[PDB]
Every structure is written in C-alpha cells, then in structure tokens.
RNA sequence: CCGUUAGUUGCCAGCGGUUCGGCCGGGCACUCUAACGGGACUGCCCGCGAAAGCGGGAGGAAGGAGGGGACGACGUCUGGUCAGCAUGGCCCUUACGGCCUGGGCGACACACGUGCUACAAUGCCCACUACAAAGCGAUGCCACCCGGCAACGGGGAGCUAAUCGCAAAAAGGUGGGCCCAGUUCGGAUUGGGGUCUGCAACCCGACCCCAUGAAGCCGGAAUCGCUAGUAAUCGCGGAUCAGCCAUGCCGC
C-alpha cells in the first residue's frame, strides 16, 4: 500500500521525463507493459482467474 | 501423362510435378544443378528417379521454396518419387525400400524455461 | 459487390456470425462469398510465476484474433436484411464495406 | 614504398599498406588505396615512386597518423585533461575512456591483476 | 572557438541563463541541473554548479574545453 | 542404457560415392553443420588423391583404413580391491569409429595449409604406412597388451 | 507450494471467461479496467446478499452484467427497489449502463465458493473450525456432489503458531484437466491477519 | 568480429546498414 | 497418416489471354488452411507365455505411450516471499510520512557468478549469386529519389493491415585480395566522422566515421552442457521501449 505515490497519473510530465509507466491492479510500475497495463502478477494471476477477456492459456 | 508427387517437411515445401518429357527441372524458376549451388544437395532430387531407372525420359517442373535449399531439395526428392506412386501405382519393392514415407518430424522444437538448445541449461562453475 | 470481416476471439462467435451471414443471405446476395477464415492470428505473452526473484516460475498463454472474410456478390438488395437484421452471435463485430 | 614511417607495403595492395602505418589499415587503407590511385589486388612490390610520390605527398597536408597522429590526439587529449571537462575524466586515472563502470573489469587501462 | 556550435546551445535549461545574464557579467555558479548540453560559444570563461548527485560543486569553465556535453565536466563517483 | 543397447544410429551412403563410409568420415571432417565445405575438403582431397596419386580414392581410403583401425588395447578393472591394466580385442564397431577419428584428427595435426592437403596427405600416408594417425595406433596397440598377465582378466 | 490455477485447468474445458467480451489493440486494456471498477465496487456493495460471481458480458456497446447469487430477496428489493439504485449508480463508472441481470442458482451445496465464503465466516464468529470444514464438506457434497475436497490455511483457529488442516469426501481429481469442478478460497478475518480457506466441489464430468 | 563493428561481422551484428551496407 | 467443408492465400494438376511477377480470366481438386471424424485396442502372421507383455514381420502418415507441449499427487524444507497485493501485531509522526534542486544505488587494491567477442584459413577481406520463420507496424512500421565518407536529414508512397510499413535472414554459391606474421585475425582502450529517444544526456546513453590499435597464436589443480534434428553453429522478430550499455530473457 504505496499510497504517497499514486500521482502517476497527474501526468504533468513537466519534462516528458517523469510521467512513468504502470500495473493498474496491483500498481508495480517495474514490468507493466501496455495492452494489460499490469503488473507481470496483478496481470497473469486475475488472468488466472479469466475474468480477463478472451486471452486463454498456451500450449504446444 | 501426369504424375504428381509433394515432398515437404521442416517448414521446407517442394512440391514435385513431372509429366512425361526429358530430364529438365524447373526449381520454380531455374533448374536442378542450376539452382542447387556446388549443392552435392543436386542429387537429392533425383533419388525416386533412381528408384526404378531413366533421367532423361521426363519433363520434370517443381513448385519449390520455402525454408531454405536442402529442406525443399529432398522434399523435391520425396514429392518426385510419390510423382512414380501417380505413375506407377504398383512400385513397392522399389519406392519403399530406397523409398519414403511421411516427412521426417525433426524441427529446433523449442526454448522454453531457458536453455536455449532446448537441453543447453547454462553450465556451472567452480564450488 | 460487398467485403466484409468479422474479426473475433470465440472460435464459436465467428462461427454463428459468417454463418448466420452467409447461409441467411443465401436467399438474397449472390448467396454469398464463403467465410474465407485467415491464419488466425496469434500474440503470445510469458510471466514469472513465482511472484519476485524466480527466472524459472512463469510460464506462458496467448491473445489473438480469429478472422472470417464473409462477403456477398450481386448487391441484389434483399440481401441487406438476411443478415444486417438476423444475426446472432456475439464475440466478434460486424465489419462491412466494398 | 617509402612513406611517412616507412610503411612498405610488402606483397598486398595498397589499402594493405598504410595499415601497417601509425593509426592505419582497416578504413585506412582504402582512403589511401583511393587516392595513390592503385589496385587493391596488387601485392605491393614495384609502386613505382612517379606514382607514390603523388599518393605520397597530398599524403601529408590531410593525413596524420604517422609522426603526427599524436598531434590530433595528443593535443586534443590535452584540452579535456587541463579543463573540468569529462571527455578526459575516465582517462583522469587509468580506467576505461570509452565506457565503462569500473569497480570490476578495466585492467585494460589499469594495468595489471593486483 | 567554441564554434563549433551556434549559438552556445545549452539545451535551454542553461542556455536561457548563460544569455542575457551573459549582460551584467557574471556573478559565478548557477548551480546548473540539466547538463545534458553541449556547452558551447559565451560559455567559455564561467562557474556554475554542477549536481554531481549530491552536491552542487563550483565549476569554472575555460577556452578549449567549454562546449562539450555538460555532464562531463562534474565527477560523479569515488574509488581509491 | 539403462538395459538396452540403445542401437547403432545407420548413416545413408555418399552422395558421391554412395558409401556408408565417406558419409560418417565427411561427418567428421565436418563442423557447425556445414555438410557443405565438409564434403568439399572430403573432395579436393580426394583430388589429392586422383592427382598427386594416381591410384584411386576407393583404395586410398580402405587402406588407410585397414591401417588406423586398432585392435587389441587395455582398460582397466576396480574388481579386486584394485584396478589392473587388461587388454581386450577392441571391437570392430569402435575400431572403426574412432581409428576413424583418429585417422581425421592426426590429419589436422598434418602441416600444408589447405585442409584437403592435410586429409590427402594423412589418408595416404596411412593407406601406406607412414604417420601420425595409425602411428598412434600402433601405440595404442601393442602400448596395450604390456599389460598382458593383467589381460585373462576379460573385459 | 504450486499447483496451477483450478480455473486455468478449467479455460477451454468446464468454466469459462465470466466477463465475455472481445475488443483488440489500443483498448481492449481500459475495456476491462472499467470491468473491474465494476466488479470490485460490484461484489463490495452486494457481498451483502452474498453474491457469487459476475458475467459482465459484451457483444457490443453496453455491458450485459449478470451477476449470480442465490438471494433473490434482498437481492431485487421488495419489489424492484434494489435493482435500481443499483443498476442506475452504474454509468457512474463509465456510463454505457446495463440492464441489472439478476441470475439466482439452485442449490448453495454445489456453490463451493458461496460455502467457503460461509465456514470462513463462520471461523469469524470464531469456533471449531476442524468441525466446520468436515461437516460443511460433509453436505456441501452431500445434497448431491461427486465429492467436496476442502482445505483450510493459516493461523488454525488459535495457536501463536500457524498451520494447516483438510478433508473430503468422494472424489476431487483436481488433476484431470477437465474434471469440471467448482474452487473457492475466503479470506481470513480472524485478528490472526490473513488465514486463507479454500473447498473444491467435484462437479462430475464423464 | 561481431565487434569488429565497422565492416562485415560488424554490422551483421550492429544489426546496422550504412558505410557498410546499403538500407537495400 | 487419410477422405470430410472450402476456396481472394494457394493451384494449375488442363488452357486461353500472358503485361509471362501467377499480371488477367478460369479451374477447387492438388500445396496452402482453419475445421471434422477415422487411424495398433499387443488388435493379426511367426517366438515366448498359466497370464500381463516383450520380442520377430508385413501394412503405412506412424505404435511399440508417433517427436513436441501443459499435468509436478503426500510432506520435507519453518526455504523464498521486507518495497508485488493482501496481513496479525509493532513502531511511527512536524514527522521512519510529501514535493522539489543534485548525487547515487553504473565509487574501485581485489574474488567469485553468468554471458560477449578472441587467438583464425575447413579463415579473414570484397564483389556478385542462390532460399524461412514464428512475431512485429496508426498517429506506427516506413515505399523510391533528393542531402548521404557515415549516424542519419527531407520529400514522400502504403496500409488500414494471409494482398500494405518492418526484412538486408546469415553460413551456403563463384571469382577475386591475402599465404600463415601478431597477420586483413583480434578488435581493447584511447585515435575520428555522424545517426538518434531525450532539454538536458558531465556523471549517467545508443550509433557512423576519423587516428590509435594493447591481451590473446584454444588457457593451471579444476570445473560445464548436451541421446539426433539433437551437440555445435547462422540468423529473423518479441515485451520492457522518444535513446538505452539487450552480448540478458522469450519464440522461431
């Protein structure tokens, strides 16, 4: 609960050079892509649970 | 008048037409020897022609590319010997033996938990 | 002359969209234009599964895009209601032009 | 042939001389193969001077390399390392100029394992 | 010298600053922050602070050595 | 294996001689796959062969073989509280194989600067009797059997 | 410490996508995002009537949105009153309302989640939670299943030290990626901080 | 090598055209 | 491995036009492709056998569970999991909490870890020659021509995305340079030019070109990977991405 710094948002890249990249579920701005916008968990384990459209586990 | 035979295989596809002629070869555009480089991979399409003798009593015309030289060569060579299975529907004792049978089943499968080479798991050191 | 994609997820939605469309605007287009599919397309993703330090838990699946390419010769109008109209699937959408 | 640090181009061509000269060869060798004007293919053992001297002389003015190439560096080295600049900072010590993260790997410059 | 660039581009941030004030003289270090520049022309001759992380040192800038990509110019480490 | 033989993978002949033999020994010559240059030095060598030899390639390459192919050495038994030194008829299967090896290797050892040279010069050389590969053998060999109280311990 | 995922084992066999939607490139994302601001604001509003899962479906611009229970009462209202504030406080997350699809099951022994979301109350009000899991198993199988395997994790009901505790009856094969099954986990109130439940109902399948 | 940057290998790997190759 | 459905991709297996690139028409079967069911149940012939089943053979797309995927049961380890999210309790607060200007987690006498490239002629150098692949591209991949030693800079066309932007796949082929030195290897580090995301790029970036070109001519005691399309080797794309130290991970 990293509350203090849920400003990611305000943009004001003032300086592209700020605004930064994001997880919507469980925040991390580490690994969060774009399409899912998702930490690699928030992401691949509500996925898990498939309430995430379409998408389907891989095989081959 | 026509004998069609198809050899692919590894993601390489040589689609063999013959239909009586000579010994000419269009690789979907130049012919044999022409287009297999220094390639010792010429004879490779020719084989189900050895099968039961002559190279030079049929036309021979090849839809081939794909994957690279020799992968589409011998799948030129298998799809010409099911071209003699068109022709000669009688032919075991020669197409299978020296024959063919399917593609081959034998792909760089795949990477997965990493390793690369599918077996190459990084080596160790020195503990 | 009409083209027409129904690009979709389900390998079912689809299936009830070109073929409510091509078989009900068979008594209406030229009768259509059979559901030319496409090679399916794939986008594959991996992720560590065993939430931080673990370059081994992941594991991987895939989001795509299915494709049927309908389309109906001889814009003999009827055509326009065996299908604008009596459709019924519903994981994909109704792509028209011409 | 004769030239600035006497870089005789033995039985190569011309680019494969100067190569052998102060900051020369690779790159090098085809600037000068250019200008001398010569085959690249000739093995280097007969460029007679009515030739040389041309490819030899403009070879001076624009060229250097040879008892000049430190100039340039040396001079231009010179610049950086007398003001707080930082072209010169990795070189301030014996680390790597270029790059590139001391602390572990850098005895290029350095010198010896110790 | 020093041009080479013109003008004495210094990606704004410090350009804006090394202009004008350029007028009144000096008065040393503008405790500078963007160095992404490539100091140039006017900036021969110059203090100003350069963030070497922590610390806001005086740098004073000479002739040869003024245009080239600020950075470089303020240390940013300490070994031995 | 863990019970079963786990065969003797078959190698199809020559594709310019139609022979087991050329095939595993190109093989050999070979690297990073490339069948390629590999079957090309096998070549120019054998145009070594052809030429600087007038005697054919067929018999070169069976007499260099009939000369680098082993035949009785020694390994040893952790049997008896011990490990001795016995000697045993090196079986066809291998002898072949690695006196094929062998034979491919002391010819990278050879000097020139061509590699066809180098296959040519061993192959010959060992054809006849004369050099490093089957040279090597001999010692392998009769270095092998020394040991020879220690052989009727069967390997 | 592993196993995967009991609905990933279920995707294309028995259980699939609630939320049944496509959409593609450059907002597909922010689709579902609103999806979950629904869900979320969803099931926290409505645990009331102790919901149980949510299908927020579409074919197209509006959201379908039948959510499932098994309380119709509270659920619609006396009357319809519910369904309203409900259904219209919608657009608030994203306009496109949705007609409020009320979809009630049949029998909360076959409702594996609902039934933990329940014995995991239970160990709220705070008691014998071994009992709890062999009984709730007992019937939540037993009014018709083909086998109720439950497991309890974390802080056993008691003791600084924490632990574990299970058991079922009939058959589980969680393995046999397709043995159409119901999984459900609670959270864990207790003061002891998070204490995981979790019961899965074989749901036949030959 | 890969590294030797300027010519062949180089670029091949650079996975760059210019002095060394044309963008085609 | 085979027939079932269907053909803007792919056929011509049979032409006709051919602008002869499959450009136009035309043919849906063949290669293509999503989709459907059938296909060794040790079922049959020969061995063995009370049996299971292994062993021989034909049939063929193939069994001997076809090669490749996902599935990791009971517990161990109180393993890992402070800052993934969740959490019981604890401490905390003009602050162990907020924002901003710079540094810094990329400091080095050193050791160990995982990879890069390298000593080369069964190679390097140059020119010309011959073919995937699973992915990727909208305010994005970027067509050819103009600026181009070069990075790149412009005009600028396309798709709207199995037909359009990425892409030049390399090793392979033919001749040509070199004939075995620290060499054309090697490309450090310091020799030069530029391309570029970004303001700014000292520290703390990627790149092209200028000069320089170090160590190394397969590496001690020792230690590693790998049953066959695999080992090795050569390449293409992929998310993080206005630039990126990606030689790392993934897929082919």
């Not at chain 1, 948002?9 to 700020?18: D, E, I, Q, S």
């Not at chain 2, 020669?94 to 080596?123: C, I, N, S």
């Not at chain 7, 084992?9 to 601001?37: C, M, N, P, V």
């Not at chain 7, 160990?123 to 939540?140: L, S, T």
């Amino acid at each position: 609960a990293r509350k203090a710094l849920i400003e990611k948002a305000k943009r004001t890249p003032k300086f592209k050079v700020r605004a930064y990249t994001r997880c919507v579920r469980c925040g991390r701005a580490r690994s969060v892509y774009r399409f899912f916008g998702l930490c690699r968990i928030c992401l691949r384990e509500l996925a898990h649970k498939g309430q995430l459209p379409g998408v389907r586990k891989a095989s081959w | 008048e026509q004998y069609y035979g198809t050899g692919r295989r590894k993601e390489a596809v040589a689609r063999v037409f013959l239909r009586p002629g000579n010994g000419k070869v269009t690789v979907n555009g130049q012919d044999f020897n022409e287009y297999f480089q220094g390639l010792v991979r010429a004879v490779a399409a020719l084989e189900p022609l050895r099968a039961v003798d002559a190279l030079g009593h049929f036309d021979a015309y090849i839809t081939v590319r794909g994957g690279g030289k020799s992968g589409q060569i011998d799948a030129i060579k298998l799809g010409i010997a099911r071209a003699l299975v068109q022709y000669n529907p009688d032919y075991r004792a020669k197409l299978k033996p020296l024959g063919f049978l399917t593609r081959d089943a034998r792909v760089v499968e795949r990477k997965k938990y990493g390793k690369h080479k599918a077996r190459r798991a990084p080596q160790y050191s020195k503990r | 002359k009409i083209r027409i994609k129904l690009r979709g997820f389900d390998h079912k939605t689809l299936d009830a969209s070109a073929q409510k469309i091509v078989e009900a605007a068979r008594r209406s287009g030229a009768q259509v234009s059979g559901p030319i599919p496409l090679p399916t397309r794939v986008r594959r993703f991996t992720v560590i599964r065993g939430p931080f330090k673990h370059k081994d838990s992941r594991e991987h699946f895939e989001l795509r895009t299915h494709n049927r390419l309908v389309d109906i010769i001889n814009p003999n109008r009827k055509t326009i209601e065996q299908l604008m109209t009596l459709d019924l699937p519903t994981g994909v959408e109704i792509e028209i032009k011409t | 042939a004769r030239i600035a640090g006497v870089e005789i181009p033995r039985n190569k061509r011309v680019d494969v001389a100067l190569t052998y000269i102060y900051g020369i060869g690779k790159a090098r060798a085809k600037e000068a193969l250019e200008k001398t004007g010569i085959n690249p293919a000739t093995r280097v053992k007969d460029l007679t001077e009515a030739e040389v001297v041309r490819l030899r002389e403009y070879v001076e003015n624009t060229w250097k390399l040879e008892g000049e190439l430190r100039a340039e560096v040396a001079a231009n080295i010179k610049r950086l390392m007398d003001i707080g600049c930082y072209r010169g900072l990795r070189h301030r010590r014996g680390l790597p100029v270029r790059g590139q993260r001391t602390r572990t790997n850098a005895r290029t410059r350095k010198g010896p394992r110790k | 010298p020093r041009s080479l660039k013109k003008g004495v581009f210094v990606d704004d941030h410090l350009l804006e600053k090394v202009l004008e004030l350029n007028a009144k003289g000096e008065k040393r270090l503008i405790k500078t922050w963007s160095r992404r520049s490539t100091i140039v022309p006017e900036m021969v001759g110059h203090t100003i602070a350069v963030y070497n992380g922590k610390q806001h040192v005086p740098v004073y800038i000479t002739e040869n050595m003024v245009g080239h990509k600020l950075g470089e110019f303020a240390p940013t480490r300490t070994y031995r | 294996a863990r019970r079963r033989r786990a065969e003797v993978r078959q190698l199809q002949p020559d594709l310019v001689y139609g022979d087991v033999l050329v095939t595993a020994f190109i093989n050999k010559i070979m690297r990073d796959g490339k069948k390629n240059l590999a079957a090309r030095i096998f070549y120019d060598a054998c145009k070594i062969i052809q030429e600087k030899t007038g005697q054919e390639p067929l018999k070169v390459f069976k007499q260099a073989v009939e000369n680098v192919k082993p035949r009785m050495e020694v390994r040893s038994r952790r049997v008896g509280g011990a490990n001795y030194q016995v000697p045993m008829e090196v079986s066809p299967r291998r002898q072949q194989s690695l006196a094929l090896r062998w034979l491919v290797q002391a010819a990278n050892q050879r000097p020139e600067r061509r590699a066809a040279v180098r296959i040519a010069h061993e192959l010959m050389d060992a054809a006849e009797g004369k050099g490093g590969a089957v040279k090597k053998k001999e010692d392998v060999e009769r270095m092998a059997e020394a040991n020879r109280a220690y052989a009727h311990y069967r390997w | 410490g592993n196993k995967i995922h009991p609905i990933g084992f279920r995707l294309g066999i028995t259980r699939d996508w609630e939320s049944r939607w496509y959409a593609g490139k450059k907002q597909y994302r922010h689709l579902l995002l609103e999806d979950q601001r629904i869900r979320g604001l969803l099931e926290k509003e409505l645990y009331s009537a102790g919901l149980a899962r949510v299908d927020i479906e579409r074919a197209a611009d509006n959201v379908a949105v039948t959510v499932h229970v098994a309380k119709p009462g509270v659920v619609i209202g006396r009357g319809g009153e519910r369904i309203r504030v409900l259904r219209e406080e919608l657009a608030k997350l994203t306009g496109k309302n949705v007609a409020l699809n009320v979809q009630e099951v049949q029998n909360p022994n076959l409702s594996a989640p609902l039934v933990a979301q329940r014995v995991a109350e239970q160990i709220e009000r705070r008691f014998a939670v071994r009992r709890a899991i062999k009984q709730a198993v007992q019937r939540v199988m037993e009014s018709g299943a083909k086998g109720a395997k439950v497991i309890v994790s974390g802080r056993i009901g008691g003791a600084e030290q924490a632990r574990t505790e299970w058991a079922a009856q009939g058959r589980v094969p969680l393995h046999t990626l397709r043995a159409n099954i119901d999984y459900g986990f609670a959270l864990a109130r207790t003061t002891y901080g998070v204490l995981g439940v979790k019961a899965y109902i074989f749901l036949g399948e030959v | 090598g890969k590294g030797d940057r300027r010519t062949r290998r180089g670029k091949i790997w650079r996975g760059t055209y210019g002095k060394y190759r044309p963008r085609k």
